[PDB]
């Protein structure tokens, strides 16, 4: 990554062994559950394009998903070249799409752009493309549609709501998914007793209010 040194200058640092093991391990235990994506973004703080490719390349399984990620990266790379078709002695001004992905760029070139004034954030741009691809994978691996989540006769309301928002998060690939239909669907798919309680609560009830009302079995 690129870090700040005590002198205040931005310098390159080798990717850490702790970080490398952490990313590999999170994939082994969580696969592509949605919470993996915020971890990838956090573990890749300051990453060069090289570092990001290293993290992706060190994942051993799930090679079907990774091939999808390469395709998604390639789609975004083509749009980059199209939106910045630009094609002097001082600094090299031209990052190409393939240069941003670390395929046709050297580490020093990557460092040169990221530490330039003004900075060309090839690391942040590439991470954006990678996260876009991972989002698609998370959606693909969602095992259940939100329409099939219904609270059981013996399911505590809390456990049903947990299941509801876990599924909603993966199919949306985003946490903020509370469209009015979710509110509606949560009540419609609730169990018989709770639904009567929720219906009597009226409109504009907070989740806290719905869950408190339903704390009786």
């Amino acid at each position, epitope marked *: 990554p690129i870090v700040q040194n005590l002198q205040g200058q931005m310098v390159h640092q080798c990717i850490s062994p702790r970080t490398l093991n952490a990313w590999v391990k999170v994939v082994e235990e969580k696969a592509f559950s949605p919470e993996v994506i915020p971890m990838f973004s956090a573990l890749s703080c300051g990453a060069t394009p090289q570092d990001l490719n290293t993290m992706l390349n060190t994942v051993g399984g799930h090679q079907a998903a990774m091939q999808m990620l390469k395709e998604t990266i390639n789609e975004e790379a083509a749009e980059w070249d199209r939106l910045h078709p630009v094609h002097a002695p001082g600094q090299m001004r031209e990052p190409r799409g393939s240069d941003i992905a670390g395929t046709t760029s050297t580490l020093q070139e990557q460092i040169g752009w990221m530490t330039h004034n003004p900075p060309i954030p090839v690391g942040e741009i590439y991470k954006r493309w990678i996260i876009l691809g991972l989002n698609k994978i998370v959606r693909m691996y969602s095992p259940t549609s939100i329409l099939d989540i219904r609270q059981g006769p013996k399911e505590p309301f809390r456990d049903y709501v947990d299941r509801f928002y876990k599924t909603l998060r993966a199919e949306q690939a985003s946490q903020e998914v509370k469209n009015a239909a979710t509110e509606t669907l949560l009540v419609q798919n609730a169990n018989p*007793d709770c639904k009567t309680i929720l219906k009597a609560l009226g409109p504009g009830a907070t989740l806290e209010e719905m869950m408190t*009302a339903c704390q*009786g079995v």
Partner: nanobody, 113 residues
Framework: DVQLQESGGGLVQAGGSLRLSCAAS????????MGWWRQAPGKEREFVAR???????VLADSVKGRFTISIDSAENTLALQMNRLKPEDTAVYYC????????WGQGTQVTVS
């Protein structure tokens, strides 16, 4: 198990106030949520008020400026004080309570004219 019944209803003039009371069996602190609905004859059931255990009361917009809901844990009753009554408030009023399911009273009639 749990039976609740409203009281305090009657006939009031336009521009008046009234205080309705909803009596509960047992202790009122055991209910996890209570509230009030009303229906006028021929009109769809309309939502009035709700209080959830540990929660600030939330009121409907057609009443937001006026009515107030209270809990007397001493007397085990949940009171709704209605003020600045308008003639459309003539309607049938129902109380509700939440435990293992939702329980309702049979209602008390409020007539503004």
């Amino acid at each position: 198990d749990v039976q609740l019944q409203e009281s305090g209803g009657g006939l009031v003039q336009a521009g008046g106030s009234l205080r309705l009371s909803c009596a509960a069996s047992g202790s009122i602190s055991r209910f996890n949520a209570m509230g009030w609905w009303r229906q006028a004859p021929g009109k769809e059931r309309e939502f009035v008020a709700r209080i959830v255990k540990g929660g600030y009361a939330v009121l409907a917009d057609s009443v937001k400026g006026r009515f107030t809901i209270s809990i007397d844990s001493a007397e085990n009753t949940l009171a709704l004080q209605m003020n600045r009554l308008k003639p459309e408030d003539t309607a049938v009023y129902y109380c509700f309570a939440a435990l293992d399911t939702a329980y309702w009273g049979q209602g008390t009639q409020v007539t503004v004219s």
